[PDB]
Amino acid sequence: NRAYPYTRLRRNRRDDFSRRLVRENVLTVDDLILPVFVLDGVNQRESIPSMPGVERLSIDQLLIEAEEWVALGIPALALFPVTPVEKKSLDAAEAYNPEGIAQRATRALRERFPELGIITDVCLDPFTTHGQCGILDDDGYVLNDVSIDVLVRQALSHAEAGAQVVAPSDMMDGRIGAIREALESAGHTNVRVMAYSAKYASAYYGPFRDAVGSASNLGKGNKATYQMDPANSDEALHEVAADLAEGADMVMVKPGMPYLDIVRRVKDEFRAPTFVYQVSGEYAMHMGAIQNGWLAESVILESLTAFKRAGADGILTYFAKQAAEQLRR
Amino acid sequence: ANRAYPYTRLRRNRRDDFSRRLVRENVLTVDDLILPVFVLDGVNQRESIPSMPGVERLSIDQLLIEAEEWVALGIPALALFPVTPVEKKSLDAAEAYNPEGIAQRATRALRERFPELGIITDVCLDPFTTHGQCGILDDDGYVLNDVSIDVLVRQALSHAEAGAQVVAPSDMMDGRIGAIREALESAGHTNVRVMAYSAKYASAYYGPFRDAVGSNKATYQMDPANSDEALHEVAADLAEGADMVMVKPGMPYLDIVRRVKDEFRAPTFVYQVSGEYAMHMGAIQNGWLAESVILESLTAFKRAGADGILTYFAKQAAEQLRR
Amino acid sequence: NRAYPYTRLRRNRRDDFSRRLVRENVLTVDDLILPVFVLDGVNQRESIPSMPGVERLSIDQLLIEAEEWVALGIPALALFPVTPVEKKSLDAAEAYNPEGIAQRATRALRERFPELGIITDVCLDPFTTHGQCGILDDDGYVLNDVSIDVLVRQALSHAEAGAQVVAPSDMMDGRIGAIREALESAGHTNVRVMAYSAKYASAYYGPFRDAVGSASNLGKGNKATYQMDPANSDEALHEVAADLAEGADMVMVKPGMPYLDIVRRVKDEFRAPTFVYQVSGEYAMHMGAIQNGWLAESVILESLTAFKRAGADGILTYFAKQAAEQLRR
Amino acid sequence: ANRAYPYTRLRRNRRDDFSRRLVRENVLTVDDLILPVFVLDGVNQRESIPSMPGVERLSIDQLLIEAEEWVALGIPALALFPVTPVEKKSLDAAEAYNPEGIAQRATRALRERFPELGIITDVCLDPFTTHGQCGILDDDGYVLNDVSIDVLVRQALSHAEAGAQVVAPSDMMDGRIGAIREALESAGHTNVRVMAYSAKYASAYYGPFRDAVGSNKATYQMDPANSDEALHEVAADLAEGADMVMVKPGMPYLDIVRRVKDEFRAPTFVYQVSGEYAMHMGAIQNGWLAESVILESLTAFKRAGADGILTYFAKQAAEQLRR
Amino acid sequence: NRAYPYTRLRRNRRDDFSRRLVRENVLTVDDLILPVFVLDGVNQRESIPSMPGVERLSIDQLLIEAEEWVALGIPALALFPVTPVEKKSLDAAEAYNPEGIAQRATRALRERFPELGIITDVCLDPFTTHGQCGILDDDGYVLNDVSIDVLVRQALSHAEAGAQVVAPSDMMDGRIGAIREALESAGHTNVRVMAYSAKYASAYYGPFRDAVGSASNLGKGNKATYQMDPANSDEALHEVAADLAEGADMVMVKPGMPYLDIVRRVKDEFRAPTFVYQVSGEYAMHMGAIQNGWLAESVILESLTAFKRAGADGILTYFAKQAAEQLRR
Amino acid sequence: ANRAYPYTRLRRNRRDDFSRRLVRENVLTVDDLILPVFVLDGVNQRESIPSMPGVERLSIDQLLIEAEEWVALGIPALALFPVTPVEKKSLDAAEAYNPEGIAQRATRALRERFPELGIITDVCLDPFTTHGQCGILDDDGYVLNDVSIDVLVRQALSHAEAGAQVVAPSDMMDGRIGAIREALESAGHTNVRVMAYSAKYASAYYGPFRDAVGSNKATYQMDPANSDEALHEVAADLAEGADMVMVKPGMPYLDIVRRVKDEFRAPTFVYQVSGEYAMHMGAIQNGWLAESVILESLTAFKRAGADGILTYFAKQAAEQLRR
Numbered sequence A, C, E: 001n002r003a004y005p006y007t008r009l010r011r012n013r014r015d016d017f018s019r020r021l022v023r024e025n026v027l028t029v030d031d032l033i034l035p036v037f038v039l040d041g042v043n044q045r046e047s048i049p050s051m052p053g054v055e056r057l058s059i060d061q062l063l064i065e066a067e068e069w070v071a072l073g074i075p076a077l078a079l080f081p082v083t084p085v086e087k088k089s090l091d092a093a094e095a096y097n098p099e100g101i102a103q104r105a106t107r108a109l110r111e112r113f114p115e116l117g118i119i120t121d122v123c124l125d126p127f128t129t130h131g132q133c134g135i136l137d138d139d140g141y142v143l144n145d146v147s148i149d150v151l152v153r154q155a156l157s158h159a160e161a162g163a164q165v166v167a168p169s170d171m172m173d174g175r176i177g178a179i180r181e182a183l184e185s186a187g188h189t190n191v192r193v194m195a196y197s198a199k200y201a202s203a204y205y206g207p208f209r210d211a212v213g214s215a216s217n218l219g220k221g222n223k224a225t226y227q228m229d230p231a232n233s234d235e236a237l238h239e240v241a242a243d244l245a246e247g248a249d250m251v252m253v254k255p256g257m258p259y260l261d262i263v264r265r266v267k268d269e270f271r272a273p274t275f276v277y278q279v280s281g282e283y284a285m286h287m288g289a290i291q292n293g294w295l296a297e298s299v300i301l302e303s304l305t306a307f308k309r310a311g312a313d314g315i316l317t318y319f320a321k322q323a324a325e326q327l328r329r
Numbered sequence B, D, F: 001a002n003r004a005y006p007y008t009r010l011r012r013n014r015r016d017d018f019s020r021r022l023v024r025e026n027v028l029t030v031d032d033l034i035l036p037v038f039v040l041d042g043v044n045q046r047e048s049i050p051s052m053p054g055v056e057r058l059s060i061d062q063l064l065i066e067a068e069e070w071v072a073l074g075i076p077a078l079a080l081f082p083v084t085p086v087e088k089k090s091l092d093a094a095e096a097y098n099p100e101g102i103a104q105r106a107t108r109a110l111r112e113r114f115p116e117l118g119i120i121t122d123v124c125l126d127p128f129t130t131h132g133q134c135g136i137l138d139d140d141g142y143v144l145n146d147v148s149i150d151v152l153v154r155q156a157l158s159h160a161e162a163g164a165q166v167v168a169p170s171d172m173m174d175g176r177i178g179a180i181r182e183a184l185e186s187a188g189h190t191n192v193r194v195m196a197y198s199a200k201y202a203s204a205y206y207g208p209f210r211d212a213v214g215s216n217k218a219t220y221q222m223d224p225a226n227s228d229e230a231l232h233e234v235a236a237d238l239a240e241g242a243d244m245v246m247v248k249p250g251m252p253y254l255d256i257v258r259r260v261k262d263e264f265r266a267p268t269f270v271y272q273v274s275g276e277y278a279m280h281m282g283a284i285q286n287g288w289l290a291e292s293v294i295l296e297s298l299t300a301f302k303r304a305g306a307d308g309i310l311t312y313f314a315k316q317a318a319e320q321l322r323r
């Protein structure tokens, strides 16, 4: 029965102090996870035109840049290897190579910065000639259970390299449980699995596929037989429920802003650690507008606050350093 | 979600600080902290309080000195509690609405000097009555409801005139929020916030505040046994126009905080009262508990859903948080 | 649509009789469980400076004091042995020694007072040199499943001694199910398991670690890799759900006052027998204030009524005798 | 929570008295018990009631004698039911508001003598009408709603003037709670509680009370079939200002108690009516049921969510509880 | 926002037609199940003083009386044998005797009235010398799992006799699942199990124990280690959930009127076929009052309507014939 | 509840008629059936309706003849629909409130003769307007809301004066329930029930009724697409004082019935409209469906939560139920 003029919702908005007192959500640097593109080789830095301000870095350069991310208090990185063209195959075997970019980078960072969280990407897409997330059958379909076998091998290799978190981004059915049972069997008791539970078949991923070099491989291919239809919301709940039952420690929605309603439903329904990826296309859209002078730089913290408001525990964001810098000030 | 060991091991996210930080559900910040402060009549005076180790009654000039650091630390607001000279107490509680009473003077001083600092005044007769009850007594010793409201209304208007951004009725009369709000609106004070003490219990935990300000209540304060009743109290105060609602005491009533936040989704505050402070500080000084119990106690309120916390630990907490 | 002045919530507060009629919760002595510190030896009584008014008692002295607890109608005791320094080890073997303090005390009390409930503590912390609740690996981490093996042995020894309730306070994952399956297999059909389900990594435990003599062992060590983060509420629901699925008969939240919101959520969510521990630091805070004249002794029953109000079925409290005495009057 | 045998054996907590006590969800206490009592016009008189074995109509002086033990036992309140002399009945029910009617006299006597004892008066015309209906009849024999309310209002004010702390309208007219509350407020009786009989059914279980007080109703009392309707009845009475709400009869309507408590979280009472008492006592005296069924019947009400219970067993129960 | 005088709840009560239009529940004879006490022998009829108007009947007499119950459209009977004293034993073997009263009566009635439902009682109490529902251990405790073994045998014997429904009234943990697995294994695919799920340790059963002749056996014994505490409501939900998971087709609350809040919660929570027993003490109380002229006979249909209102699908009631007769008129 | 085959076989309870009867969730009875009837102006006249096979428009004397059997069968109420002579139609719809209009005459006749039979009158202008819209038209052809209400109010009062126990506004003007209820209360008709057609859709299923009574509406009747909107319609009608609420059409809107019952727990009715009847009867007469589809259709409404059903099958159903 709250009614104007007895209730005037502007009163608490009248002054900064009262806005601070009634503020429902506060972003902190504990919320930020930085994705990073990792090159092979030494002393390599490469700009990405469709992700202004982000560079692909060789491992040596990554370790230098990480000093600052650690100093800013960024809790974790999510690694994305930029696989050389020659290491792509039909069998995706590079995925489980102990000397692959991801495994080498993990061992280097685990050594150098023991408190920094490392989240490796469990997916075959960086490793396939065709750019799909799994192994194809003779009809061109991404086979579910054969792909899981490879994913398992990959996840184990990551655990062996020391990754504290493996994040399967593949959208195969059942892979969380398969990976978890493999980790348990092998004694990797405490390796976290951060499931990409509700990962949509989106147009927002284009810049990332440029950054990692899978755009050329995928071409005009699509992923509608495994990634979720953008139209579907209830389905995301079923996806998350399975992954929690299968042993996920964290669950993720991807993409992010375009799916904030999904974040809120998933947090409300399961009350579990819930993450969201502000993907490459989201970063690119915002950057582009900022550098054109169309949007003020304040939009960065507004975009991130939205995820917090929608119920996210943490956010994978290419803005993590920028944001950490602003928050610290 | 059919989560089962060993597929689900809840300790995995606990393994490392980074993952604990990622999955952490609540983070206290200085934005959460409101400092109560006991205000004396004089100049260049401070007094120690036997039952509130570490807390000083401060004359207004001393308040303004300390307020420098409070503001520097980012503490958003203060809650003022005047220490009324005994000569100013009466059966009619008229001192409550004296334009040059302590609270009014303190408010004007602080408003002018630290314009961004929130000032929350106490609307209650208890510092002004010779008997220390929160309202006016009838011949049987009963606290009169509606008679008391009339005084409280004049009080609240006097605070608005002094410049308070928030008035906080702590009296537990029925209907007082509506009466106060209708008086503020009619006077043109359309942005003065009302922070209702909605679910304020008849508690043993207030002993030390009575030492601090120099002052039974079961016919107006709530029975500690009752939880559902708190929801009806809050409902009425929101309908009557409260901008924020408060539970008092605090840690002994964390269940009430959570139910109030869950039920109404409105700005909800909690008071970590004098006895809660005293217990904690006493145990800390005795060496029985680590200093860490201060931030743990305050994290509890955030976890229970509080938007902000009235706490005598506000400065110490703000300091620790800034490290 | 209840509105002043038609609705005046003070009317029922006007008189004692009406306050009694509308009172939502009434504490009784059926709510009180007394923790007690048990020494080895004979005719031993020791004060604890950080728990004024509580004594550690040898078994003979415990049996004498128990006559009065039984007379007051206190339903159960929770036993906490004060392990001699020389019986602490890396392997915690004393935990399952049939001639350990807990097992001896249980057999004595089961004999002397057959109707009195005995709740033994299932944890390795009193028995380890390092004071952690489980067995350490070579990185200093408390190993989950190896610790459970010891806990199991301990629980069985307690059942063998006649304890009606075993209460695992260890916070290892899965231990309720492991203990339950062991009890069932061994024919201990009716031994209750009172899980410490939501047990937080708290500062409020200091006096107890003084009382049992584990403070020196633990030193500055912490338990954040197993006990819960104070910040977390939803997580407590997941903890409780697992322990009910695993066969707990009762579930507990610890500490108590600082976590009353957890008590209420757990009762509301599961509608199961829910207990709360008013821990040593809580007792010490209140006692200290009472003996300084800062708080009236009425605070004791107010503190206990809060647990009842928050939904607790029973309360582990060092005030149990004091409170029983007051209630009886 | 996926609880499954044999990991979960619900009998474990049942194994021992101590564990049954630990997990026990509800405990009846004397605080729950309100004693109805039938009050005669005379002096030094008691009468037995054929259909309520063990229950005596009591003149006021005898009431005051018995009230000593009731108070000693801790029984919080009585609910008075006058046994009106036939010569005082009329079509206008004016005896209802007679300042020296039985209920008014009894109230004043008890208020003065046992000031802490709660007195709940019955607001209804049925003891005062020649026809025994709860309201005034029109020419077709229909109980007039609004005309009846006017009488009930005068009745309730007469009880407030006599000192009753609680008035309990048992008439089942629409809107009567609001009318009564607006009359009490306007007269200054701001703390007189109203215990509404909110969901009172058209029941066969009232036969023995009509023998007791010396007196069909389907156009005002509720149809036993209806559950949802009870929620609408209660909702209106809370909005109209009831301090407590009541379901009557009691055990045959335990489902309604539970729904009412769950829906509104308000102070909820239940009447274990004359027929419920008579059935139980008859079976106990016949040797067909053990005396233990008294406390079992009353435990049912607590379990269903009742705050308090109007029961003719109140003294026997209080005695058993005190052992 | 419904408010007087716009809303006057009496308007629909003004006339019979409108009361009928808004009436929420209507009892019908499809709701009534008749319990019946069965004697051994021929041409035997015995009154029961504590259940006025009810007779124990030998099988021949039962078949005669059943013609009228069938004609009235009573859907089912619940049989309760009156076991001869000499057939009571420690092992309860009479429970599974193919020539026991229950098995003989079932075969007779299945033959004579093929459409009439027969619900047999699965419990050891009619068959034990001590009157407890199960087999005692050497401490006098009713053993759970050993009792189930006997119950299983009994249930199978009933299925063999042709009973369409077996109703375990024993309150052993897990017995629904054990019985169901036995029935399935033996090919009794369609034998229904009507679980007494929430059966309370009540004083209301005295007349029945007179009627079946177990009062003398039980004496002053109690059943608090298996039947539910009257105080407990949430516990009933846990009891029902287990029995549905274990394969019950119907669930029952007993006693009835004193537990109507339980009926409503169970229906609301599970939305499953829910039954309630108006027990012997309930019948006796009402009869006694009716025959004393204290209550009108209308109380019978009022009592039964309450069960319907509280959500019961059907009611076990000794008033079934009386009520069927009234409804038919 | 983790129920799983083969431990759970849902067919077990289906095995036998007795167990199907035990577990049956809903039972239709004659108490559920309200018969709509088309009433002609004359004497000794009946007319057949091409699009409603089997249904006869009846003059009042013929209505009274048939009402004998309806009452004998236990049918609780009728809903009257007059067949207005074309000469009595107008732009102002004044015939609606004519004291000797068909509906008024029929009501008085039936009230006097069958005093226990409920009579539900139709409050709408559509039988009285030359254009057949449910309200008064403006110059653009729009149905005026508030102007129309004034007419409907006079109509409803005329029905109350004639003795109708229930008036049923079928017009879908906003606010009409409140206006009607305030007029009935002010006139002293305090027990006249209002059966609101709350969620009445702009439907193709009404074609045959327009043939029957001898008469687009998307600016007042609801869009068939909308479900949530029905809840807002019902909410308003309950607040405005409706005693019962109705969904129309019926089977095509069973989802709405269920949501309305679940949301409000109030007396909820449904109209199995002319087109639903015609479809069913046509298919039955063609031999395409068995007669059993009548009781199946009506069982659907009970299952969806309806308290009662307006259905042209009422007599046939009542007959079948009585066998």
Ligand SMILES: [Cl-]
Residues within 6 Å of the ligand: A024, A025, A026, A027, B027
């Ligand atoms: Cl936040």
Ligand SMILES: [Cl-]
Residues within 6 Å of the ligand: A187, A188, A189, A190, A191
């Ligand atoms: Cl690991």
Ligand SMILES: [Cl-]
Residues within 6 Å of the ligand: C024, C025, C026, C027, D027
């Ligand atoms: Cl209680």
Ligand SMILES: [Cl-]
Residues within 6 Å of the ligand: C187, C188, C189, C190, C191
């Ligand atoms: Cl055991």
Ligand SMILES: [Cl-]
Residues within 6 Å of the ligand: E024, E025, E026, E027, F027
């Ligand atoms: Cl029904």
Ligand SMILES: [Cl-]
Residues within 6 Å of the ligand: E187, E188, E189, E190, E191
């Ligand atoms: Cl079968």
Ligand SMILES: [Mg+2]
Residues within 6 Å of the ligand: A171, A172, A173, A174, A197, A239, A242, A243
């Ligand atoms: Mg998936």
Ligand SMILES: [Mg+2]
Residues within 6 Å of the ligand: A311, B025
């Ligand atoms: Mg959150």
Ligand SMILES: [Mg+2]
Residues within 6 Å of the ligand: A030, A031, A312, A313, A314, B021, B022, B023, B024
């Ligand atoms: Mg976070």
Ligand SMILES: [Mg+2]
Residues within 6 Å of the ligand: B044, B061
């Ligand atoms: Mg100075």
Ligand SMILES: [Mg+2]
Residues within 6 Å of the ligand: B172, B173, B174, B175, B198, B233, B236, B237, C009
């Ligand atoms: Mg209030």
Ligand SMILES: [Mg+2]
Residues within 6 Å of the ligand: A024, B305
């Ligand atoms: Mg919040």
Ligand SMILES: [Mg+2]
Residues within 6 Å of the ligand: A020, A021, A022, A023, B031, B032, B306, B307, B308
């Ligand atoms: Mg805040």
Ligand SMILES: [Mg+2]
Residues within 6 Å of the ligand: B010, C171, C172, C173, C174, C197, C239, C242, C243
């Ligand atoms: Mg756990």
Ligand SMILES: [Mg+2]
Residues within 6 Å of the ligand: C311, D025
């Ligand atoms: Mg409880």
Ligand SMILES: [Mg+2]
Residues within 6 Å of the ligand: C030, C031, C312, C313, C314, D021, D022, D023, D024
């Ligand atoms: Mg308890």
